[PDB]
Amino acid sequence: MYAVFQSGGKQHRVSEGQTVRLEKLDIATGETVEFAEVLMIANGEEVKIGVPFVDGGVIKAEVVAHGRGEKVKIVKFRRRKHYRKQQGHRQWFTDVKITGISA
């Protein structure tokens, strides 16, 4: 029981009952999210997409966390040119829990 869907420009392989950290979405922290753009629905028998976004498949997930990613330091330094620059970044994420996969 697993499916592949594209949400934030990248495809995620998720099975039933597991949480996946994906790109932040303008959505509430406790509202079920619907993703009708699913690439494959997998079972004992395999069904493949003759055209993108299957025919009636959809992914039902619930948002869990809306925090930020780990600290990453961006250090730019030029050798012998009296130049160095410091910068930090923390990419936002919206963790969701995959609770239901349709056919």
Partner: protein, 72 residues
């Protein structure tokens, strides 16, 4: 309210500090460039000096005189 008085916006510049870090901008000779007469402490040419060329106040001629009557 004594600890509330603040200066008007734009009334302070904070100045410029030379030779203080890399991100401060004008450091490492702080805005006077690499080797040269200007880069040395106490350097620079006197007023009107044109690197040996005759200054304007030397190439131009004198004319007229100061009249004491005009001062009274």
């Amino acid at each position: 309210r004594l600890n509330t008085l603040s200066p008007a916006e734009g009334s302070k510049k904070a100045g410029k500090r030379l030779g203080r870090g890399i991100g401060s901008g004008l450091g490492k000779t702080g805005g006077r460039g690499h080797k040269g007469q200007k880069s040395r402490s106490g350097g620079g040419v006197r007023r009107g000096f044109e690197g040996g060329q005759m200054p304007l106040y030397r190439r131009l001629p004198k004319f007229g005189f100061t009249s004491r009557k005009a001062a009274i």
